[PDB]
Amino acid sequence: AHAFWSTQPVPQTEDETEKIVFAGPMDEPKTVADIPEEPYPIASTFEWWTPNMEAADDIHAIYELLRDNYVEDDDSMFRFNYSEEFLQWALCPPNYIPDWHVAVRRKADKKLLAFIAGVPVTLRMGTPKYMKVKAQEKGEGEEAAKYDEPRHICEINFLCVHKQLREKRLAPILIKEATRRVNRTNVWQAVYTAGVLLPTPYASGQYFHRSLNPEKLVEIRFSGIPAQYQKFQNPMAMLKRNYQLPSAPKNSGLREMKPSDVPQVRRILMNYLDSFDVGPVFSDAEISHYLLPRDGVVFTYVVENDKKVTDFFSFYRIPSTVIGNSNYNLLNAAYVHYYAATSIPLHQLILDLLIVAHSRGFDVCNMVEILDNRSFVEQLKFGAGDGHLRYYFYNWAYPKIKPSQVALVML
Ligand SMILES: CCCCCCCCCCCCCC(=O)SCCNC(=O)CCNC(=O)[C@H](O)C(C)(C)COP(=O)(O)OP(=O)(O)OC[C@H]1O[C@@H](n2cnc3c(N)ncnc32)[C@H](O)[C@@H]1OP(=O)(O)O
Ligand SMILES: CCSc1c(C(=O)N2CCOCC2)cnc2ccc(OCc3ccccc3)cc12
Ligand SMILES: [Mg+2]
């Protein structure tokens, strides 16, 4: 049933994942010297290409491939349209490895046909709390703790095959070449997410949406006006009032994050993230890169009242092309990114996220039920969607965990 995934070092069934007790590698250890030095073979009409993410033009070629051929729902309503500014941000964090950006082009016209990207991440991925308890009970602490140290691994994202080349087994060849390039840098694990079920997730969570511009959403969504608004005389007026937000933030002291905030944001975020079983560790340079505001891409506010930063939140922008509409070309979504609250309740911090996003002309705020996101779903009027984000590791055995034990946000 999986001609490619059956050949890879990943858990092969749900049952296998539910029986794993300790974190650790799937494969026995290899060295960089064991790994082929030459690119994986490809058909003579194609060639491997390493785009330069410094170069505006190479970013633009990747942007167009993804604009026309990236993730689209099963009803062909929406397709993500990550901006060029976003792809530069995502693809070039501190100490990124250019070789981990892997593309296929047609040899004749140099048309870009496929892409996949890896970036570095430092991840806590040792045995989860509930499994460490089971291990202490049985005198197996030392085994359970062996891979507790944060590991410098690869995060994979942006896998894409052009629509004309679908179902030709090109995605496996991109996955193999990316694995080769990562392994030749002495990295042996990756983390990735997908909205589809593959073998085999260690965690899965539903997506949640909070309408910010419900009229637009009703024009473009399959279901809007949501049917349960039909018992009213004016369904649309009741829908608008349901989702209405204040026009200005409520936390006194909220302001945009600035470079001097980096060390305090790093500290409050690290203290919060360290409570979860799977989560990143960020250097000051990675806090600066992923959290300082960047126009049209990432938006980050701190609560500082008395010249001390006690709270912050961030969101990032992913527009989608709206495939079948007269009125609207684009859906402007704000996705909840990292946050930390030490002085106000999390729901009060995130309400100011919604207030800012709405003031800036976003249509919807999205998130997955990771972190403590479930804590404010009902009061802030998020609704579950149809989708699930599934979290995976490559070459890492890991017990099944709840998505409220995952602290890694995927872009
Ligand atoms: C140590 C370092 C390791 C680094 C590598 C770590 C692994 C990284 C893994 C990648 C994480 C990516 C994270 C993201 O970016 S998730 C976003 C994925 N992108 C899209 O959904 C964009 C639109 N769709 C497409 O571009 C294509 O349909 C793709 C490229 C998805 C498949 O192309 P195509 O439809 O033309 O099919 P094929 O004939 O070439 O290939 C068929 C094989 O592909 C398997 N498949 C289908 N979807 C996915 C998927 N989302 N992750 C992994 N595998 C996938 C499928 O099970 C089958 O294998 P098997 O069932 O027969 O065995
Ligand atoms: C985030 C999953 S839903 C989705 C949106 C989205 O934000 N929506 C659509 C429903 O109206 C408001 C919220 C926007 N553009 C998309 C583009 C592709 C797509 O493919 C399905 C998918 C399912 C799970 C995870 C990722 C993608 C879904 C969406
Ligand atoms: Mg293919």
Author numbering: 11 to 421
What are the paper's exact sentences on this?
N-Myristoyltransferase (NMT, EC 2.3.1.97) catalyses the transfer of the fatty acid chain C14:0 from myristoyl coenzyme A (MyrCoA) to the N-terminal glycine residue of substrate proteins. This co- and post-translational modification is ubiquitous in eukaryotic organisms and plays a central role in a variety of cellular processes such as the addressing and reversible anchoring of proteins to membranes.
A ternary crystal structure of 19 in complex with Leishmania major NMT (LmNMT) and NHM was obtained.7,32 LmNMT and PvNMT share 39% sequence identity and have been used interchangeably for structural biology studies, with LmNMT offering the more robust platform for rapid crystallography. As before, the ethyl thioether chain in position 4 seems to stack against the phenol group of Tyr217 (Tyr211 in PvNMT) and the position of histidine side chain continues to adopt two orientations. The orientation of the amide undergoes a 160° twist compared to the initial orientation of the ester, allowing the carbonyl to H-bond with Asn376 and via a water molecule with Tyr345. This change is associated with the full rotation of Phe232 (Phe226 in PvNMT) to accommodate the presence of the morpholine ring. It remains to be determined if these changes are specific to compound 19 or if they occur with all amide derivatives. While the 2-hydroxyethylamide derivative 18 displayed a significant loss of affinity, the N-morpholine derivative 19 showed an improved potency, as well as a significantly reduced clog P.
